[PDB]
Amino acid sequence: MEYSNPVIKGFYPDPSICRVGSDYYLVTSSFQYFPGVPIFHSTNLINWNKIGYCLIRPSQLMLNNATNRSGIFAPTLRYHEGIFYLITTNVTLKKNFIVMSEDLQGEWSEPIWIDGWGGIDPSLFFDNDGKVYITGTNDNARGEELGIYQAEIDLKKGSIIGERKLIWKGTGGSYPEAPHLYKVNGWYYLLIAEGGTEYGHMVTVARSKYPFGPFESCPFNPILTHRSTNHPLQAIGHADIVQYHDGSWWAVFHGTRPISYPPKHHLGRETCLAPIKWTDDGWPIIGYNGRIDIKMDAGYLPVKEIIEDDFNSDIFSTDWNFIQNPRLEHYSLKGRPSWLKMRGTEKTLNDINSPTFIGRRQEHFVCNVSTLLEFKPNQDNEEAGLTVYMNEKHHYEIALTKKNGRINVVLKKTVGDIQVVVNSLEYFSNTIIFSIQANPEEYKFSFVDPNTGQTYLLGTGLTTLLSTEVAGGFTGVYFGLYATGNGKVCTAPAFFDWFKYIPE
Amino acid sequence: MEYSNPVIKGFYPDPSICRVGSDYYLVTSSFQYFPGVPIFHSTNLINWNKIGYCLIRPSQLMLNNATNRSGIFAPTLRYHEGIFYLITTNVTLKKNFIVMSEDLQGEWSEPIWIDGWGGIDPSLFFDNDGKVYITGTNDNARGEELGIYQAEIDLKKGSIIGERKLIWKGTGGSYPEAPHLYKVNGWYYLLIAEGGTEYGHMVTVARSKYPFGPFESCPFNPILTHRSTNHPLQAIGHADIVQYHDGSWWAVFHGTRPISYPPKHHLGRETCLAPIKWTDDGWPIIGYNGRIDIKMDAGYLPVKEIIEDDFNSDIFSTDWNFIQNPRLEHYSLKGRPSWLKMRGTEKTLNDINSPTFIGRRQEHFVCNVSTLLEFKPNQDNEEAGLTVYMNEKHHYEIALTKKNGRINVVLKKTVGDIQVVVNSLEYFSNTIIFSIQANPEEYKFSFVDPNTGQTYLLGTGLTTLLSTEVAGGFTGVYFGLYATGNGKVCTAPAFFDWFKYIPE
Ligand SMILES: OC[C@@H]1O[C@H](O)[C@H](O)[C@H]1O
Ligand SMILES: OC[C@@H]1O[C@H](O)[C@H](O)[C@H]1O
Ligand SMILES: [Ca+2]
Numbered sequence A, B: 001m002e003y004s005n006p007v008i009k010g011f012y013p014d015p016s017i018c019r020v021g022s023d024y025y026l027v028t029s030s031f032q033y034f035p036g037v038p039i040f041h042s043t044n045l046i047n048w049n050k051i052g053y054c055l056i057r058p059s060q061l062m063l064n065n066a067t068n069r070s071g072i073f074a075p076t077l078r079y080h081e082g083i084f085y086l087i088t089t090n091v092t093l094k095k096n097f098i099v100m101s102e103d104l105q106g107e108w109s110e111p112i113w114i115d116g117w118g119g120i121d122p123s124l125f126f127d128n129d130g131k132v133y134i135t136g137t138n139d140n141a142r143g144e145e146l147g148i149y150q151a152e153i154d155l156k157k158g159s160i161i162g163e164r165k166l167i168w169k170g171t172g173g174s175y176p177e178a179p180h181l182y183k184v185n186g187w188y189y190l191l192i193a194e195g196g197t198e199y200g201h202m203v204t205v206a207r208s209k210y211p212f213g214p215f216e217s218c219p220f221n222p223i224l225t226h227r228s229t230n231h232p233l234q235a236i237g238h239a240d241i242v243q244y245h246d247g248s249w250w251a252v253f254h255g256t257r258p259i260s261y262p263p264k265h266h267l268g269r270e271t272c273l274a275p276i277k278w279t280d281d282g283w284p285i286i287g288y289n290g291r292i293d294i295k296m297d298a299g300y301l302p303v304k305e306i307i308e309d310d311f312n313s314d315i316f317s318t319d320w321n322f323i324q325n326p327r328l329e330h331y332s333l334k335g336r337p338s339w340l341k342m343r344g345t346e347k348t349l350n351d352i353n354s355p356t357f358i359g360r361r362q363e364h365f366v367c368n369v370s371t372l373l374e375f376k377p378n379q380d381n382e383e384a385g386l387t388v389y390m391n392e393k394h395h396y397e398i399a400l401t402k403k404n405g406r407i408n409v410v411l412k413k414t415v416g417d418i419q420v421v422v423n424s425l426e427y428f429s430n431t432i433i434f435s436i437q438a439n440p441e442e443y444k445f446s447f448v449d450p451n452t453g454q455t456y457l458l459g460t461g462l463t464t465l466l467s468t469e470v471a472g473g474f475t476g477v478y479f480g481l482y483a484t485g486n487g488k489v490c491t492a493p494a495f496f497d498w499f500k501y502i503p504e
């Protein structure tokens, strides 16, 4: 039997996995998006269902001034004696913290702040003797030596027990990071990422008889990389190991699907899966001797997408994210039952701090995304529409606005410093359907006059100008509904009747 | 003593070096630019003076349909018994050929076509017994196995002697290429590039007692790479080895100076230098154990930029290139003595085939480039100016044109599919000075009214949107003078009085 990589498509980086009985739970990084840290469930490691998010309250997730270069970085999920622990970094605060839960269907605790523990990629390991270890990277604010650091931790107080020690510098790649400590057959293994989360990404491993080392580098490191290859999956690493309940071993990790030349990616880093075998001399090998594929053999794993939101519910679906903490008064599912009402502010898609926007990830190269908007702008600055958004300097949008006292539908783009109105047509109806067809190379922007059903191709836009390589940061493209008054509060409300996401 | 890398700054890739006595000659790839294959001279390996180009006649250099993804790929320069040989690929023709010279101050021969020898990166080696070997890559048109191929060659007839054989597949990196065969102390060494000429680039080496092998991989391959590092020099490889006349060994090779995150480069691949030491077990080591730097120790090498063209000469300087073969009638240094006259055609900077343009490489991050233009356009399509140009979809320009019967100075940009007029101002004089200040992040576009000396900042543009990563191809940014009629022949002539390039 076979599965396909990625196993979780779209913007789902830095996967960390946790087994409880015969069920599996998995978390990814979310940066400036709210709610933060999606969490998934699976019984077979291949098929994942999103259960929700871990960070859903402003007290858990302070995103003021966060951008797609900051906010929430890699999270690690662990379980001990009925309690789940989620440990991560808010890079905008430069703070590491834990939240806890005894029930993933409920909400998580308030943060337990780890005072004095810097760096990124914090991880926890519950040792068989009852000791608990925190492992992480060098602290850039203290200007520490590059490498992996560790201490015993008291999980109640959020405080270190004894001393913080350097345990490994890695093999010599850049940015030794993503550390996870495991104990298997009488050896401690330290699994890390090196080379940076771009084309030099690799996974390396070390071992010792003791939790703090000294650690010996695996003689065939790196144990997983696509560096110096032209494989369709690139930038592979940030692995976390799990033992399936049939006894076999697996890793989850992220990778990209770049297109064009030089390679460029716009769906973010996506969660992948590969098997592990243990050598006779006691080292793990991932995949086909350090390389993986799009199509994989499933071993003994038991093998087994149209999304339509009409906004009838008064709870938002788990697809939707906001840019930083939502200003809650500017969204309503109750003010006009069966529509989403949005109040645009002075802030635009060019601004980082709390623009009126709700969005969901592009999870497929080929897809058609649409919405129906009612909007009658009162002034020329006023605008509402549908956006393809990477970050504040990289986004395309089709929208209704007003220019010299006439209503127009527009295609607008922000690419770096370029802000351009690509096309403009006069429009005469109170509602409009926007419709975007995505393929690997371009987005086609159309609008429909709803009562006639007539469709009009307004323009197109390249995917590669929204790619992470061009745009910066650590994220993937979102499809978003938004409103703005372009420097003033938008006096007209925007109402969205529904949103459809139809992958090929 | 110390030198700085790169030793040849700006767009100078795939360097191949050749010693004759106590002097050194070096060539680089040029793609769609004409004249093709620049050639440099040095006495110390650090300081290079451009002597001219190797391919200066249409019969040598057929560039119709060539773009910055095609045209002339890596060249190799060799010397035997008073005769220099230059061997390279015209990828647009898919043909490999040699040109010869007995005097580098003169012109080279007509091409000797190597019938049936495909692939890229052809190289020559003159063995101590008098045999001559051609070495190259797999032929994509025949769909051959990835690797390095070799035959004995008859240099008169341009024909293979005996059989073409696969001699090495490399260590397992992508795109094994840039092969050079050497014989040193009784061993043949095969030096190659792997991993692709981007962030996975590396140099690897193999050896044998026989010219066709079997070849044994160096046990510490790769012998030069910056893959999986954050060093300011990236994408290092395509090396060629030389023995200096004091007995010490050196390699030239290319690398990039990327900026931003993810890393992006706009000065092209630039020629670098590093020392070689030979191990006791008979393997070469480049640099500081496989890594190099911006600042290097010069060993015993004997250690030691404002460019102003007023167009008074009737020969073009060696700074200037055209996009493909120039249409010679559309440029004149004699029609108006002391100016360059240019006749714009229907073709624009958006078109690949022979737009009216003359340009020179950006060789410094920080520089000020200027020109003085006389231009009085007769119709609204007519345009002449100064361009910052990467390729047909990636260029910025400040120009004089006409709109609804008025003369305007404009800042225009083409970025992917986006074509935008960023700013426009009415202009009232027959001449204008355009002036561009470059720094690592942006270009600032100004104009000067010459008789008043008043200066006006028209706009700015990001460097990263012209980067190779964004734009495609294998080249660096040029500063260019151009004219066009935007779909029609330009009825007005354009005259440029001078051009200044002032690095910081
Ligand atoms: O994804 C953000 C950061 O990049 C690296 O993957 C690191 O492990 C993580 O925290
Ligand atoms: O620069 C063009 C091609 O890329 C690689 O550097 C190869 O060696 C060369 O022919
Ligand atoms: Ca509805």
Ligand SMILES: [Ca+2]
Residues within 6 Å of the ligand: B310, B311, B312, B338, B339, B496, B497, B498
């Ligand atoms: Ca002059």
